[PDB]
Amino acid sequence: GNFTFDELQAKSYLEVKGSTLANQCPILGADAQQGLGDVKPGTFQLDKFCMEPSSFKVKMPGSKEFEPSTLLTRNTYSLDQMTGSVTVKGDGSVALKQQDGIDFAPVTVKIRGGEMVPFMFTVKNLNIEGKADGLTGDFTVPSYRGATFMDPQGRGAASGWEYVKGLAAAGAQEELAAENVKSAAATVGEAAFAIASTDAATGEIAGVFVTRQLADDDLGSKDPATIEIEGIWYGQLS
Amino acid sequence: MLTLKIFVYTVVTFFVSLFIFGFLSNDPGRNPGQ
Amino acid sequence: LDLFDDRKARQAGFDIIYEARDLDLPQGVRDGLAQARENLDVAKARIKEAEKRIDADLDAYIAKAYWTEGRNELRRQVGTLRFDLNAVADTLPKAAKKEAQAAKNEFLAAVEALDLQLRKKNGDKAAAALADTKAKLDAVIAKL
Amino acid sequence: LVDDRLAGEGTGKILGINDPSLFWAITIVFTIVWGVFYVSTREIDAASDRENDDDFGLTL
Amino acid sequence: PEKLAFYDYIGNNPAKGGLFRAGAMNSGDGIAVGWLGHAVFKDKQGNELFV
Amino acid sequence: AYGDAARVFAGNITNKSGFIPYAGEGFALLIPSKWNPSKEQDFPGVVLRYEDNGDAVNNLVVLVQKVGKNNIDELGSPDKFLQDNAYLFGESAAFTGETLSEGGFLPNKVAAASVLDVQEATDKKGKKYYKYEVLTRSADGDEGGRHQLIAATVSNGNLYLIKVQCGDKRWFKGAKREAIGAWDSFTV
Numbered sequence: 001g002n003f004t005f006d007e008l009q010a011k012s013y014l015e016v017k018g019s020t021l022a023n024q025c026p027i028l029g030a031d032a033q034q035g036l037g038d039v040k041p042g043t044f045q046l047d048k049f050c051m052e053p054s055s056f057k058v059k060m061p062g063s064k065e066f067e068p069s070t071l072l073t074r075n076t077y078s079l080d081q082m083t084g085s086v087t088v089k090g091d092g093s094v095a096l097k098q099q100d101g102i103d104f105a106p107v108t109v110k111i112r113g114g115e116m117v118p119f120m121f122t123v124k125n126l127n128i129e130g131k132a133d134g135l136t137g138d139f140t141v142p143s144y145r146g147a148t149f150m151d152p153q154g155r156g157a158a159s160g161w162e163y164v165k166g167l168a169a170a171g172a173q174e175e176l177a178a179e180n181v182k183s184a185a186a187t188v189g190e191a192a193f194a195i196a197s198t199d200a201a202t203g204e205i206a207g208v209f210v211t212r213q214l215a216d217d218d219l220g221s222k223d224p225a226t227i228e229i230e231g232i233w234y235g236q237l238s
Numbered sequence: 239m240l241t242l243k244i245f246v247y248t249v250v251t252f253f254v255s256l257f258i259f260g261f262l263s264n265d266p267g268r269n270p271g272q
Numbered sequence: 273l274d275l276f277d278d279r280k281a282r283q284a285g286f287d288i289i290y291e292a293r294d295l296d297l298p299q300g301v302r303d304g305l306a307q308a309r310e311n312l313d314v315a316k317a318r319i320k321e322a323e324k325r326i327d328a329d330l331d332a333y334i335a336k337a338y339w340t341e342g343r344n345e346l347r348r349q350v351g352t353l354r355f356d357l358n359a360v361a362d363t364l365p366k367a368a369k370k371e372a373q374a375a376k377n378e379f380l381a382a383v384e385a386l387d388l389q390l391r392k393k394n395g396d397k398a399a400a401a402l403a404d405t406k407a408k409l410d411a412v413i414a415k416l
Numbered sequence: 417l418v419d420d421r422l423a424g425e426g427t428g429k430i431l432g433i434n435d436p437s438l439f440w441a442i443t444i445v446f447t448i449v450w451g452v453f454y455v456s457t458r459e460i461d462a463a464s465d466r467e468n469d470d471d472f473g474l475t476l
Numbered sequence: 477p478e479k480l481a482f483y484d485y486i487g488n489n490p491a492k493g494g495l496f497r498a499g500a501m502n503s504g505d506g507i508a509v510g511w512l513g514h515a516v517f518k519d520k521q522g523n524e525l526f527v
Numbered sequence: 528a529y530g531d532a533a534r535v536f537a538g539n540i541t542n543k544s545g546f547i548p549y550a551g552e553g554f555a556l557l558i559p560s561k562w563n564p565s566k567e568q569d570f571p572g573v574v575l576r577y578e579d580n581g582d583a584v585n586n587l588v589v590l591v592q593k594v595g596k597n598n599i600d601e602l603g604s605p606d607k608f609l610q611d612n613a614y615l616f617g618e619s620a621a622f623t624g625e626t627l628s629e630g631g632f633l634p635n636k637v638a639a640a641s642v643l644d645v646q647e648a649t650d651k652k653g654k655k656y657y658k659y660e661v662l663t664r665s666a667d668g669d670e671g672g673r674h675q676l677i678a679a680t681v682s683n684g685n686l687y688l689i690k691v692q693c694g695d696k697r698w699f700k701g702a703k704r705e706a707i708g709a710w711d712s713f714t715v
């Protein structure tokens with residue numbers, strides 16, 4: 001980060017263009033009170049909710065420990081401009097729900113062995129609740145590829161060949177029955193958010209997040225891996 | 239990555255300066271004509 | 273397939289993109305210049321909305337030092353202001369339209385100065401230019 | 417962010433210089449080659465057996 | 477006869493091969509062992525369909 | 528031999544309206560001249576089908592089906608009539624699965640139809656008509672959607688229906704004129 005919302009809005013597009021400052025989340029100023037602060041309990045309209053990751057770890061299927069990864073797709077992995085609702089109770093319990101905005105970004109990373117691991121970084125339909133110390137919830141992870149995506153050989157779920165057109169002699173291809181079927185089914189993930197600062201003067205919040213989800217499976221043709229994503233986040237309450 | 243950029247800049251400017259100052263060194267006079 | 277009721281989309285302006293691409297229609301109809309001249313109510317409403325937006329939003333953005341937002345606002349909805357002013361002033365007698373043209377030219381010079389100051393990122397100069405622009409816009413609106 | 421990069425592509429810098437070290441490298445190498453050429457340009461001219469007057473050069 | 481049925485096969489058609497597809501047709505299609513039968517396709521109303 | 532001289536120095540074009548009139552069994556319409564006859568029967572009761580030379584997506588079809596009712600309104604409301612005849616836009620029966628990765632589509636749906644306009648009107652003779660205008664979109668989104676124009680009526684105990692299809696890509700490039708002309712010329 002190292003820039004606030006006012007500082008970011010004080011620039012020009014020609015000055016931000018190319019500096020990778022558009023892939024980062026703003027931070028709060030010195031006026032921010034620690035933790036929940038002095039926010040009046042109630043339901044607010046969430047806006048400008050963004051999450052900037054700071055580390056990716058991959059646990060390959062068959063391993064019990066996460067591993068570091070190297071990003072391959074440059075600065076395209078920040079979710080931003082999400083909108084929703086935030087409710088604060090008198091005790092201190094907070095509930096966050098995400099409705100719209102850019103809540104998904106495909107990401108590809110490489111691991112120690114040399115295997116690229118695509119995954120679909122998303123917090124779509126986020127539903128978390130708990131104290132300001134930590135909010136535990138879940139989200140839905142849509143398929144990496146759509147239903148109309150066609151593989152190299154022209155096989156897709158809702159459009160494409162249902163078999164291998166190259167091998168004409170093999171009438172049924174019972175050996176290839178596994179790879180001829182495509183399923184773009186969705187899954188779910190888990191999240192653990194926290195709140196570190198709050199400014200009731202302008203209705204701004206910030207904290208950290210840790211999420212766990214699954215990699216892609218090439219439309220049901222692979223065993224997905226588990227990826228842990230951690231970083232910071234920011235949002236505005238109004 | 240900055241070290242690689244510096245090294246490449248040095249190499250490129252070396253070769254281009256060689257080209258320029260070689261073609262400035264009375265090149266038209268190097269012919270077999272009388 | 274599965275039916276959906278979207279009959280109210282046409283009332284929301286669904287045919288604007290299809291009419292703008294109709295090569296049979298004249299260029300004035302495609303660009304919307306013919307409709308505004310035929311119906312001056314749209315021009316008057318656009319002028320009033322542009323004035324109100326200029327006042328409130330320019331004050332807010334210059335106060336908070338939002339230069340990009342200020343310039344975009346100056347050319348997002350106000351983008352038809354010159355054409356609307358010309359169309360309104362063309363329906364006036366010779367002397368009245370001449371005075372309106374002079375006032376409009378002065379106002380446009382004021383807006384140009386304000387945009388220059390916003391680009392140069394000055395606060396007090398931009399505020400003074402904005403006050404002058406508001407005064408000139410009020411004068412040209414009263415002239416029409 | 418996850419990693420770090422120069423982040424200079426598509427910016428519009430003069431000769432692509434984001435650090436003064438590139439300027440120093442360019443200037444030093446150019447000056448060295450120019451000085452080497454400048455020392456010898458007097459000897460090189462004398463190989464034509466002619467003086468560098470107003471009529472010097474390849475002319476037609 | 478199964479011979480007459482086998483003669484009606486585009487796999488046995490000679491203009492379906494390749495220049496660098498070496499070997500016998502048994503190396504590309506497999507050794508035939510039996511005739512499945514004449515497949516007849518019918519509509520839901522009973523009308524015949526032909527491929 | 529024929530003996531007919533060539534039309535040299537002729538300043539008149541035989542046909543320039545862009546349409547060719549057609550006289551059928553109980554109906555008449557103006558078919559675009561650039562279209563060709565087709566041998567496809569996708570819906571029950573197809574008695575006429577024409578498709579464009581440059582694109583097979585643009586086509587029209589006329590259905591004459593047998594019904595008991597002698598009037599169109601006895602088949603239900605225009606919304607109910609359109610709901611009953613929803614097979615005219617096709618079905619996603621071959622796609623049997625669940626998905627959540629579509630752009631602007633409901634879950635497990637790879638196609639949708641937007642009813643842009645409905646209308647009920649009577650001709651000069653005095654026969655009621657049901658006019659529809661739909662835009663069907665696909666998950667992949669070929670041609671940027673398809674425009675379906677439907678006009679249905681009942682005469683002598685039979686339902687007469689016409690559906691005119693035109694891809695959006697061709698629709699906004701100037702081919703909407705032919706489709707609208709064929710749709711508006713349907714007389715029974």
Ligand code: CLA
Nearest residue numbers: 440443444446447448449450451452453454455456457458
């Ligand atoms: C403090 C920096 C500085 C230095 C070191 C010099 C030095 C020199 N000047 Mg002057 N000059 C300066 C400032 C400086 N100038 C400025 C600001 C102006 C603008 C008005 C001029 C205008 C000027 C003119 C118009 C001319 C000179 C000339 C000369 C050269 C005369 C000796 C020669 O004939 O050898 C022959 C020279 C060589 C074989 C080059 C040998 C390589 C050495 C290392 C050169 C030093 C280069 C560089 C400036 C070093 C910077 C030092 C710093 C990085 C530590 C000599 C290189 C004359 C010259 O010969 O021009 C080429 C000449 O005609 N100067």
Ligand code: CLA
Nearest residue numbers: 490492493494495496497498499500501502503504505506
């Ligand atoms: C003159 C014509 C002729 C014909 C029509 C046949 C026909 C047949 N042969 Mg017989 N054969 C011949 C001569 C011929 N043969 C000769 C002269 C020999 C002695 C070497 C053999 C030895 C022989 C063996 C050992 C076998 C056959 C088999 C077969 C059958 C398989 C065909 C095949 O796969 O070829 C495919 C041929 C090619 C891909 C080469 C075509 C030439 C291309 C266009 C150019 C290559 C040139 C280039 C410079 C090569 C560079 C080499 C390097 C770069 C790798 C087929 C019925 C096979 C079989 O089924 O047996 C039961 C088998 O196993 N043949």
Ligand SMILES: CCCCCCCCCCCCCCCCCC(=O)OC[C@H](CO[C@@H]1O[C@H](CO)[C@H](O)[C@H](O)[C@H]1O)OC(=O)CCCCCCCCCCCCCCCCC
Nearest residue numbers: 243250254257258424425426427428429430431432433434
């Ligand atoms: C102008 C003096 C010429 C003197 C004689 C020269 C003779 C020929 C010498 C060789 C030339 C070819 C090789 C050059 C290699 C080095 C350059 C290079 O790779 O730069 C590549 C670099 C790329 O710089 C990039 O910049 C990015 C940010 O913008 C990032 O920082 C990148 O990291 C960085 O690499 O570009 C430059 O250095 C810009 C050069 C601008 C040159 C302007 C010349 C103006 C005067 C001439 C106008 C006409 C020119 C021709 C137009 C028509 C052509 C059909």
Ligand SMILES: CC/C=C/C/C=C\C/C=C/CCCCCCCC(=O)O
Nearest residue numbers: 239240241242243245246249250252
């Ligand atoms: C004088 C000319 C020199 C010739 C020497 C020849 C080849 C040297 C090649 C250099 C290219 C290196 C590319 C990789 C740099 C390191 C990248 C990294 O950070 O891992």
Ligand SMILES: CC/C=C\C/C=C\C/C=C\CCCCCCCC(=O)O
Nearest residue numbers: 430433434435436437438439440443
């Ligand atoms: C002895 C004094 C005489 C002459 C010296 C005069 C001027 C020197 C000025 C500048 C030298 C450094 C130039 C740096 C260029 C920009 C580098 C960058 O963009 O980082």
